[PDB]
Design a protein around this ligand. Structure first.
Ligand code: 3VN
Ligand code: MG
Ligand code: MG
Ligand code: MG
Ligand code: MG
Lengths: 296, 296
């Protein structure tokens, strides 16, 4: 199976006067490339996929593909949808426009059954020939891809090579890798990056890496080399920022942090997402002071 | 405040080949009208809003308005979105195409803060002059509209007049009507229709009414006329079918029941939704036998 693993960043999408700041987007991706990141994920949840138009979503995939040409950094395009026909269309766009693979979140709101999730992902995987990473985040979608469904899709669909778990369930991550040790388990939960890697996970899709890509990259590569003392040390040091980046709904804190670090021009969201509270703004600012934030 | 209350049906959307069966759709609405229903809700969750195109969503609103003209039946159009710009667009379409009001679900997946929900709904309410009913279903959206936010929106916006609660939280329904008794609390949870009505709720937006509109209508009208004895009696009798209609994710069981009753031609969903499992198919069929289903 072809895989995309290592340290990866769920890219934020900067806005300027209600439109996608495309130069800031490319500049942010190049900052990720230059700090050891192995792959970037345009237009995930952290990239506000819900409020981008289908055309802006496509533009951001293209910018990511264009920016990473001539580097070893891969593009794992955000292509999830709660409608299978739309998810197939995004997957086909990502394939035809040079993405190295796709991340495909479990359908949200409409709560498909396990059989529906299987058929949903089978239709996506059969539509392209690039690697497909499942994405389970039940707190966001209202549905869970069971371990059995993940393993079945991995074994039945040639290009489905793993899952990005954001479920706070280390038991499930043992379950997954004990029964199917060839799949690529990816951490979608920064605070527990090291435990997931230490059990045989092969990478991270990180929110914190937007702010501290060098630290998340070092953590992941230490862990992949079984240097668990150095990987755990970074994971422990990052715990405070990893948690405060979810004091409000992601990506509200991370965009606040990027703005406070001067890495983005304006602190702009698209409704229903909004600027954080004044208290949380100050709490994000205070935790940042304990970390060294790389510039451009 | 202008309000839309009473017994309301979250209409299923029948498919025929790969498209919406528009004549069956109109036929189902006239069956609802004939069975005492006060309003119909096109393209809600039960109507598979996630997998309809924006054009199909708009078409189903038009058919509902067309069909309910000259009857007392109102159209509370499903107009929710997890992107505020899209929810404003659906709200404005519903106003300009003759809907009596809109149902607007809390944003799903991107999980806005309470402040974001306020601004999301304030932007929608200010975009039209027809009643707006909030819709809280955290099991599916991943977020909750708090009691404080619902009451604030009710008091701050002229056309926001209440909430359809599908949260299994009768405590919250006491909280809502004790602090703001002027709002229209609507049950979005069939099994507990009567308890919500008996506490001062003023209507239901029902899934079971798709199959048994006469029973849900009588239940609501018994309760609003303070005949609690008969309202509870129908609620108790409907419990078995109310529960089996969610043995799998709505609207998979209700569409199965409508197909088994001969009310729709094919048992068709749009992926990721799928026909139910086989023993669940038999359980829906067995519970249906204890109820008298009205034909056309
Ligand atoms: N990423 C670019 C497009 C985003 C579209 C959407 N906001 C809404 C998705 C949708 N399936 C739209 C269909 C609604 C038509 N009635 C949904 O709202 O469920 C989402 O996927 O979150
Ligand atoms: Mg727009
Ligand atoms: Mg180059
Ligand atoms: Mg090495
Ligand atoms: Mg009436």
């Amino acid at each position: 199976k072809n895989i995309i693993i290592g340290a990866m960043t769920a890219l934020i999408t900067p806005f300027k006067n209600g439109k996608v700041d495309e130069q800031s987007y490319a500049r942010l991706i190049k900052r990720q490339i230059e700090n050891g990141i192995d792959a970037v994920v345009p237009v995930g949840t952290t990239g506000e996929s819900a409020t981008l138009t289908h055309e802006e979503h496509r533009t951001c995939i293209e910018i990511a593909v264009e920016t990473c040409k001539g580097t070893k950094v891969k593009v794992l395009a955000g292509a999830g949808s709660n409608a299978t026909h739309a998810a197939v269309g995004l997957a086909k766009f990502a394939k035809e426009h040079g993405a190295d693979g796709i991340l495909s979140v479990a359908p949200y709101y409409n709560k498909p059954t396990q059989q529906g999730l299987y058929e949903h992902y089978k239709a996506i995987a059969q539509s392209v020939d690039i690697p497909v990473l499942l994405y389970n985040v039940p707190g966001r979608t209202g549905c869970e891809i069971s371990t059995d469904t993940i393993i079945k899709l991995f074994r039945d669909c040639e290009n489905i090579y793993g899952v990005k778990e954001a479920s706070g369930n280390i038991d499930k991550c043992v379950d997954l890798l004990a029964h199917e040790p060839r799949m690529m388990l990816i951490s979608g939960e920064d605070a527990i990056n090291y435990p997931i890697l230490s059990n045989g996970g092969k990478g991270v899709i990180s929110v914190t890496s937007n702010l501290l890509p060098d630290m998340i990259s070092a953590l992941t590569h230490f862990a992949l080399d079984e240097n668990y003392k150095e990987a755990k040390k970074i994971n422990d040091e990052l715990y405070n920022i990893n948690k405060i980046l979810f004091c409000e709904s992601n990506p509200i804190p991370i965009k606040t942090a990027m703005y406070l670090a001067g890495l983005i021009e304006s602190l702009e969201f698209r409704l229903p997402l909004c600027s954080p509270s004044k208290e949380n703004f100050a709490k994000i600012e205070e935790v940042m002071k304990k970390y060294k934030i790389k510039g451009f």
